[PDB]
Enzyme design. Sequence first.
Site, PDB file in Angstrom:
ATOM      1  N   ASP A   1       0.839  -1.197   0.000  1.00 15.14           N
ATOM      2  CA  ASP A   1       0.000   0.000   0.000  1.00 15.14           C
ATOM      3  C   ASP A   1       0.873   1.245   0.000  1.00 15.14           C
ATOM      4  O   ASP A   1       1.354   1.663   1.056  1.00 15.14           O
ATOM      5  CB  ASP A   1      -0.879  -0.020   1.237  1.00 15.14           C
TER       6      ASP A   1
ATOM      7  N   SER B   1      -0.679  15.583 -11.931  1.00 18.97           N
ATOM      8  CA  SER B   1      -0.925  15.225 -13.315  1.00 18.97           C
ATOM      9  C   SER B   1      -1.174  16.488 -14.124  1.00 18.97           C
ATOM     10  O   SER B   1      -1.716  17.485 -13.629  1.00 18.97           O
ATOM     11  CB  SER B   1      -2.139  14.295 -13.393  1.00 18.97           C
TER      12      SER B   1
END
Length: 330
Positions: free
Chosen positions: A35, A199
Amino acid sequence: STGSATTTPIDSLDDAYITPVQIGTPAQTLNLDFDTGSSDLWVFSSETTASEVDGQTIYTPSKSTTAKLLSGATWSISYGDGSSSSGDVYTDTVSVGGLTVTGQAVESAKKVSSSFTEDSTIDGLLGLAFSTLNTVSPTQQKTFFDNAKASLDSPVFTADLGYHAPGTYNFGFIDTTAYTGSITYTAVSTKQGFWEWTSTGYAVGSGTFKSTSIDGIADTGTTLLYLPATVVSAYWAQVSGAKSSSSVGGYVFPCSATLPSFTFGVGSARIVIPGDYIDFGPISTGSSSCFGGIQSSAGIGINIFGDVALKAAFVVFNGATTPTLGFASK
């Protein structure tokens, strides 16, 4: 040193991926969910409340000659999905794919929430976010990667998650045969303890690319892709009959639909998520309403590039003094 381990989807939907991890001496192999959005290595154990164990493999520290109680240390974690676990702490030898760390904090669960009990395939979590998020008290502990870093050939790990197929976690090297083209690296903020990056935009299907900054985290422990409501609405508007269902808890779409791809930007590069990766199947057995793999982050507080996005890429988690993320197509 290096390590390399195969990671395997737990079910036919790729809801999560499990990777075998050797703990203790002799080794006890547990299948952990790696994770990158958390920083605790915790396991089902011989200390876990018996009614909360349902098929998981447990760590028994009393059977490990290298286990040592970390005196006074406790841990307690709550995840973004509302699940939680807590317990005490041992140090022990932990190996992943041939890479061994001695003295790793292994957090032994005394209690786990129902979602963990109900998932017999996941024996615990191995956190790979920054150690500042580790919950052990009163002395915070380091992640497996943080402990291994100095020994690795290069201070990196890579995630290569498969679509409906196994993939690979590598530590200490970048497998140049595992991706196409080049890897585009992008800046990371560690201010919240995550692999947080920005992004450069998105496209829906064959549509034009929208240049827009989307801050979010690379999180292998989250199944879906959670993005701003504007982006998510633009995606699902291209699927006839798709709608956001308050009762189901997100966007659903007719199972008869063909889904468009979704592209996200990494610098000037582009990662394309095929439409099929966005199908999470019937909302309940036999239903013709299917659950979408792109969902709004509006109720979370952060955008999350979970498995839906990451499995479309070869992803480099560069833990150099100034960390960066790398993405390549594959």
